[PDB]
Amino acid sequence: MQIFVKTLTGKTITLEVEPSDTIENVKAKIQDKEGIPPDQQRLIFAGKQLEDGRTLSDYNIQKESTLHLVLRLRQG
Amino acid sequence: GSMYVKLISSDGHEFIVKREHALTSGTIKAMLSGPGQFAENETNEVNFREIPSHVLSKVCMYFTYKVRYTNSSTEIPEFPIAPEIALELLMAANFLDC
Amino acid sequence: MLRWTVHLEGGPRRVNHAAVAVGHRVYSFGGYCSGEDYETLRQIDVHIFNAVSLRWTKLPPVKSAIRGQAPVVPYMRYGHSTVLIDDTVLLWGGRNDTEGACNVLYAFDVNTHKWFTPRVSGTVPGARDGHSACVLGKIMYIFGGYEQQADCFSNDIHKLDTSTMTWTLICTKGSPARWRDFHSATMLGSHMYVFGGRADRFGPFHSNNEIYCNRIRVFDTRTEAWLDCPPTPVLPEGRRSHSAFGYNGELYIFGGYNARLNRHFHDLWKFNPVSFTWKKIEPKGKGPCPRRRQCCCIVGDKIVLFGGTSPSPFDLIDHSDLHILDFSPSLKTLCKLAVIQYNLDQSCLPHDIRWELNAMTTNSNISRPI
Amino acid sequence: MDVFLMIRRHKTTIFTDAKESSTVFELKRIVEGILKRPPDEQRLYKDDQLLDDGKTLGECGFTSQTARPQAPATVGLAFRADDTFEALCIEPFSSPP
C-alpha cells in the first residue's frame, strides 16, 4: 500500500509502507526519502499524535491516507 | 532666549531661524550657550565663515524637517539631497553636529 | 524619519540565537546554522557587534578555571533566551539536537566574560525552547515555549527574583494567553505585552490544528493578572519568530513567519499601548528580505537586526547579514548615504568622516558567503 | 494645515511656518518682530503677485502640500523706502560645483 506524509508548509512525501509497520518504521522511511532524523519528526493522524510503538493498523490508517508531519523548529 | 537666531553664511546671506530649530545642531547649541552669551552680551547670531549660502539654506531646511517630523510615524517625503551638494552638505553636517 | 541605514555581511550566520545590547555593543549567544554540528557537545558561542565601529568579533573558547574541572559555559544551543540585568546576562532554556533537557540558569558577566551557574531555588520551569524572556527591575519573566519533558506548549509565567535567585510559578488572574511558542514578550512600564507565536487552536498539544496568534495579550506584573483588552481596528497578520522591541514607550514587531500562509515577513508594526492601537510603519530604504527568528537589539535610537532564516533565492538559508534601522537619522547620516549612493569621490572628505563611511561599507570576517 | 516658508528680501531669509488659515497680515507681524518694520511698511509677494493683508495663506495659493519643511515656499518681501516701496529683489544663493 501507499500513504502520504505532508508538512503544513506543503512538501508531500509518498511512502510505500506495510500495514504492520510501526510509527518508528515510518519515521525511518521518512528519513530515507528526505534525510530528516526520526527524533525531529512528529506524526499526527485525525488529530492524534502517533506513538513510536504502535503500528499503522493500530491507528486505523488505511490506503491513500495522509499523515500530518511536524518538525522541530531549529530555525524558528 | 530670543525666539529667533541669525545664521550668516560665508557669502553674507543671513538666515533667520527659530532658536529651537537651530538647536538641532549641537555646534550651534554650544555657540548659543558660549561664554558670556548672557544679558545684553547675548548676540543671538552665528557667523559661518566657511559654509556658503547654498549649503546653509539646505541645513536650515533640515532643521525644519527634523523638528516637524520627529516622532512622526506616517509616510513623509524623504529629505532631498542632490549629488552636486552631497559632499559639501556632508562636511557641513559633520561640522555642525546635526 | 525612520530609515534602514546600514546593511553589512560577514557576521555570524545564525538563526534562533539570542542577543542583548550592552551600551553600543551587541552580544549574540549561540543559535542554529544549517550544516553545523548541534549533536556533539560543544561550547556555546559569543559574538560581539560594535555598533560604533560596525565590526563583529568573536570571544575565544572558555578555558578550565581549575585543573581537572570542565569549563563553566552553556553547551551550544538554539531557542534559548537572554536578558540583561546590570552587568549580567541571564541565559536560560533552549536545546540542541542531542543532549536532552537543560533548565540550568546561566549567568554571564558582560565585563569579565566569566560564566557561572547561580544556585536557584523554588519552582524551576521545565526545559523548553521558543519561550520569551523579559525583565522588570531584578525580576526575570519566562512565558510560554514548548516544554521538552511534558511535550506540550506552555502558557505559564515563571518569574525569577534574581535578588534571591528564587523561581515562582505565578498563579495568575484573568484569562491567560494561549499556550504558544516563538512568540514575543515585551515590557512597557510594568506591563508585559505578548504578541504572536505558534499555537494550537484547541489546547496545549500538537493536533494538526496549528494557528498563528495576532491578538495581543497583556500581563500586569503589579497585580499579576492578564488584562481584558479592547479590540483594535487593525492588527498584524499572525506570525511566529518575529522580533519585538519597545522603543520610546511603544511596541514594535518585525518580520517572522506564518506557516498557514507559508509567508515570511519583513513588515514593521507599531503598537501604542496608551491608545491601544496598531499601525503598520514603512521605513525608508530597502531593509532586510523577509525572514524569521532574526534578533533585534536597541542601541540608542537605532535597532540592530541580524541573522535569521528565509526562503532560498527545504530550500531555506540562514543569514550572516546585519541591518540597522535608524529611527532618527541625522543630516550627517543622510549625507553619508547620499555620498555612497551617488558614488562620489570621498578623498577630499576629512578623515573622521571617511572612517565612518568605511565603517558602514566594510563586511566583517566571521563568515564568507555560502 | 501648516505651511513652511522662506520670507526673502535682498540677502535676508526668514524660515518660518504658519497655518494655511493664517493671514498675510499675521505673516507681516512675524516679520515685524524680527526685522522691526511695521506691516504698513511691508509688501509680501508670491512670485510677482502682491499679497493682501486680509487673505489667508491658502487663499494666496500656499498649501501644506506645496510648502513642506524640506522644500519651503518662498514669499518675497519689500520694505517702504521713503515715499515709495523698494523694488522686490531677492539675491540668489551661491552655487555648487
Numbering used by the authors:
A (entry chain D): 1 to 76
B (entry chain C): 15 to 112
C (entry chain A): 1 to 313, 321 to 377
D (entry chain B): 1 to 97
What sentences appear in the manuscript?
The largest cohort of CRL SRs recognizing terminal degrons are the four BC-box proteins in the KLHDC-family (hereafter collectively referred to as KLHDCX), KLHDC1, KLHDC2, KLHDC3, and KLHDC1031,32. These SRs all feature Kelch-type 6-bladed β-propellers that recognize C-degrons bearing terminal Gly residues. Members of the KLHDCX family employ Kelch-type 6-bladed β-propellers to bind substrates, and a BC-box binding EloB/C that serve as bridges to a cullin (CUL2 or CUL5). Importantly, we discovered that these E3s share a defining C-terminal carboxylate-anchoring element (R/F-S-R) establishing them as C-degron E3s.
